[PDB]
């Protein structure tokens, strides 16, 4: 019910990236291009809980929230929440292959979520909740087709689960229709780290102070 919008309909957005200079990671200490690195993209939903899981994972060196797989340029997150950039939200995820691998970060993401729900995931509806897994570096379309082969071998498995298709999007950043990501406002990098008493929307509890923990 959620639908992408026609690219010549999206929002302009600006030349200017809305967080030019990111502070380093609230909990490791890090920002991008350490040598050495590989980055993958990873879209599961709400960008918080994903970028909490990624920056937890042994290997994982460096991680960032933000947009990609749609055409606004430097989007602001009130603009994404429109549905009207086409983007999905993202963690970027940059890891030391020496100690996690590009296949074993695709398992996680695909345990991590239902990817067969389309525009949405969970209670989150909108096309910005949408799977994905985009591809960066000088092998970019063989890892793209690296992901392909890993995510279809979950398909038979989410079929007889009653679940229909897998909706994972996948391909190389570069050939998203932007072709590029874009990080969120400051606020959002390690919002869960940051702000203890936030938390995903419609994750609230019955018991204590109706905060998950
Ligand atoms: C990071 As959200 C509040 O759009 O799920």
Redesign the pocket.
Known sequence: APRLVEEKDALKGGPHPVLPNPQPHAVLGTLRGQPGTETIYIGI????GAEKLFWETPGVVYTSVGFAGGITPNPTYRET?TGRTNHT?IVEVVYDPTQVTFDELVVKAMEAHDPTQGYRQGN?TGT??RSAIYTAGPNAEQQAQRAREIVEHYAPKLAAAGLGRITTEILPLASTPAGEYYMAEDE?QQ?LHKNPLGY??HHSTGVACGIPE
């Open positions: 939903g709400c960008y918080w929440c939200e989150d910005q909740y959002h919002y995903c929307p």
